[PDB]
């Protein structure tokens, strides 16, 4: 347990370095791949973003997530603005930002997927 504590303290500072508005880590999942829906072609594309997923909250307690990319300096930090914008479909978390902007997340471990989904919904529960 103690090695994980230090690891989360280090991860949070890596996060704050790229994204100083991040206040804390809610939860984590390893080996997440990111896809984008090209509706100008009706095709999913796999992005170059794969790495550790961090569900985080703002200093204003807005909920979002970061994927620290294991391939490049280009990470991804997105907000989850409305809980109904996130759907568990098949093996994927589908995240729709209003006006037809859709990303999809694949978590290596199926248990991370349904756990993170619940934590996302409960984090926004009001």
């Amino acid at each position: 347990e103690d090695e994980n504590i230090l690891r989360n303290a280090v991860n949070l500072q890596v996060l704050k370095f790229h994204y100083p508005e991040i206040e804390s880590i809610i939860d984590i999942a390893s080996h997440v791949a990111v896809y984008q829906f090209d509706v100008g072609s009706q095709k999913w594309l796999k992005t170059s973003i794969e790495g550790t997923f961090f569900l985080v909250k703002d200093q204003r307690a807005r909920v979002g997530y970061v994927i620290l990319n294991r391939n490049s300096p280009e990470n991804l930090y997105l907000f989850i603005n409305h809980p109904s914008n996130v759907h568990l479909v098949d093996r994927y978390l589908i995240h729709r930002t209003e006006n037809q902007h859709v990303v999809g997340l694949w978590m290596f471990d199926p248990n991370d997927m349904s756990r993170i989904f619940n934590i996302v919904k409960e984090s926004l529960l009001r």
């Binding site: 896809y35 999913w44 796999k46 479909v89 098949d90 093996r91 859709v102 694949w106």
Partner: peptide, 19 residues
């Protein structure tokens, strides 16, 4: 309102937007 080593992008379900 919609409806419908890492996997190939072709495996993801297709979102459909309604009007």
């Amino acid at each position: 309102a919609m409806s419908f080593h890492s996997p190939a992008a072709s495996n993801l379900p297709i979102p459909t937007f309604l009007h």
